[PDB]
Design a protein around this ligand. Structure first.
Ligand SMILES: [Ca+2]
Length: 127
Protein backbone atom coordinates (compact mmCIF):
# COMPACT_ATOMS: atom_id res chain seq x y z
CA UNK A 1 0.00 0.00 0.00
CA UNK A 2 1.06 3.60 -0.70
CA UNK A 3 0.24 7.28 -0.62
CA UNK A 4 1.29 9.51 -3.53
CA UNK A 5 1.09 13.29 -3.31
CA UNK A 6 -0.95 14.57 -6.30
CA UNK A 7 -1.59 18.03 -7.70
CA UNK A 8 -4.87 19.76 -6.84
CA UNK A 9 -6.76 21.59 -9.58
CA UNK A 10 -8.77 24.72 -8.71
CA UNK A 11 -10.82 27.13 -10.81
CA UNK A 12 -10.33 29.63 -7.97
CA UNK A 13 -6.63 30.41 -8.37
CA UNK A 14 -6.09 34.13 -7.90
CA UNK A 15 -8.33 36.74 -6.34
CA UNK A 16 -8.62 40.51 -6.21
CA UNK A 17 -11.02 42.94 -4.68
CA UNK A 18 -11.82 45.63 -7.25
CA UNK A 19 -13.51 48.91 -6.40
CA UNK A 20 -14.62 52.04 -8.17
CA UNK A 21 -17.58 54.40 -8.48
CA UNK A 22 -19.25 52.64 -11.42
CA UNK A 23 -19.59 49.48 -13.48
CA UNK A 24 -17.27 50.94 -16.10
CA UNK A 25 -14.53 51.53 -13.51
CA UNK A 26 -14.82 47.93 -12.31
CA UNK A 27 -14.20 46.85 -15.92
CA UNK A 28 -11.22 49.24 -16.08
CA UNK A 29 -9.89 47.46 -12.97
CA UNK A 30 -10.52 44.00 -14.54
CA UNK A 31 -8.52 45.29 -17.50
CA UNK A 32 -5.71 46.51 -15.21
CA UNK A 33 -5.53 43.07 -13.56
CA UNK A 34 -5.28 41.22 -16.90
CA UNK A 35 -2.44 43.45 -18.19
CA UNK A 36 -0.53 43.42 -14.91
CA UNK A 37 -0.97 39.74 -14.07
CA UNK A 38 0.00 38.65 -17.59
CA UNK A 39 2.81 41.20 -17.86
CA UNK A 40 1.45 42.30 -21.22
CA UNK A 41 3.51 44.76 -23.25
CA UNK A 42 1.56 46.55 -25.96
CA UNK A 43 2.29 47.38 -29.59
CA UNK A 44 0.55 50.36 -31.22
CA UNK A 45 -1.95 48.74 -33.60
CA UNK A 46 -5.53 49.08 -32.37
CA UNK A 47 -8.85 47.30 -32.76
CA UNK A 48 -12.24 47.99 -31.19
CA UNK A 49 -15.35 46.08 -30.08
CA UNK A 50 -18.63 47.01 -28.44
CA UNK A 51 -20.03 45.55 -25.23
CA UNK A 52 -23.39 46.20 -23.60
CA UNK A 53 -23.28 48.56 -20.64
CA UNK A 54 -25.37 46.34 -18.36
CA UNK A 55 -24.43 46.62 -14.69
CA UNK A 56 -24.78 42.94 -13.85
CA UNK A 57 -22.35 40.20 -12.86
CA UNK A 58 -23.38 38.26 -15.96
CA UNK A 59 -22.47 41.08 -18.35
CA UNK A 60 -19.24 41.61 -16.40
CA UNK A 61 -18.42 37.90 -16.69
CA UNK A 62 -19.17 37.82 -20.44
CA UNK A 63 -17.16 40.97 -21.09
CA UNK A 64 -14.01 40.09 -19.18
CA UNK A 65 -13.99 36.54 -20.57
CA UNK A 66 -14.33 37.89 -24.06
CA UNK A 67 -11.26 40.05 -23.34
CA UNK A 68 -9.38 36.89 -22.31
CA UNK A 69 -10.41 35.31 -25.65
CA UNK A 70 -9.09 38.39 -27.44
CA UNK A 71 -5.88 38.17 -25.44
CA UNK A 72 -5.44 34.57 -26.71
CA UNK A 73 -5.79 36.08 -30.19
CA UNK A 74 -3.05 38.59 -29.52
CA UNK A 75 -5.25 41.55 -28.50
CA UNK A 76 -5.40 43.21 -25.05
CA UNK A 77 -8.09 45.57 -23.69
CA UNK A 78 -6.59 49.05 -23.37
CA UNK A 79 -9.17 51.83 -23.25
CA UNK A 80 -12.87 51.93 -22.44
CA UNK A 81 -15.29 54.60 -23.61
CA UNK A 82 -19.00 54.72 -22.83
CA UNK A 83 -21.27 55.30 -25.83
CA UNK A 84 -24.90 55.46 -24.76
CA UNK A 85 -25.82 52.22 -23.03
CA UNK A 86 -22.77 50.44 -24.43
CA UNK A 87 -19.03 50.41 -23.95
CA UNK A 88 -16.53 50.82 -26.76
CA UNK A 89 -13.35 48.95 -25.89
CA UNK A 90 -10.14 49.76 -27.74
CA UNK A 91 -7.71 46.83 -27.78
CA UNK A 92 -3.99 47.10 -28.57
CA UNK A 93 -1.84 44.44 -30.20
CA UNK A 94 0.19 42.50 -27.67
CA UNK A 95 3.92 42.89 -28.30
CA UNK A 96 4.85 40.32 -25.65
CA UNK A 97 3.69 38.71 -22.41
CA UNK A 98 5.67 37.83 -19.27
CA UNK A 99 3.63 36.41 -16.44
CA UNK A 100 0.80 34.17 -15.38
CA UNK A 101 -1.63 33.23 -18.13
CA UNK A 102 -5.22 33.82 -17.01
CA UNK A 103 -7.64 31.20 -18.35
CA UNK A 104 -10.89 32.78 -17.26
CA UNK A 105 -12.81 34.96 -14.88
CA UNK A 106 -15.00 32.61 -12.80
CA UNK A 107 -18.29 33.27 -11.06
CA UNK A 108 -16.63 32.55 -7.69
CA UNK A 109 -17.46 35.33 -5.23
CA UNK A 110 -18.55 37.59 -8.12
CA UNK A 111 -21.14 39.90 -6.51
CA UNK A 112 -21.35 43.69 -6.84
CA UNK A 113 -21.76 45.46 -3.49
CA UNK A 114 -22.59 49.14 -3.01
CA UNK A 115 -21.13 51.15 -0.12
CA UNK A 116 -21.87 54.84 -0.44
CA UNK A 117 -20.19 56.01 -3.64
CA UNK A 118 -18.26 52.74 -3.94
CA UNK A 119 -19.18 49.75 -6.05
CA UNK A 120 -17.02 46.71 -5.30
CA UNK A 121 -16.60 42.95 -5.69
CA UNK A 122 -14.10 40.18 -5.47
CA UNK A 123 -13.02 38.72 -8.83
CA UNK A 124 -11.60 35.22 -8.94
CA UNK A 125 -9.64 33.93 -11.89
CA UNK A 126 -8.66 30.49 -13.07
CA UNK A 127 -5.01 29.96 -14.13
CA1 LIG B 1 -6.77 26.27 -12.48
Amino acid sequence: HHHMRKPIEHTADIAYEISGNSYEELLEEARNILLEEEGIVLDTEEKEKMYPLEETEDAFFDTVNDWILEISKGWAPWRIKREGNELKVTFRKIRKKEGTEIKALTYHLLKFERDGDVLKTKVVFDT
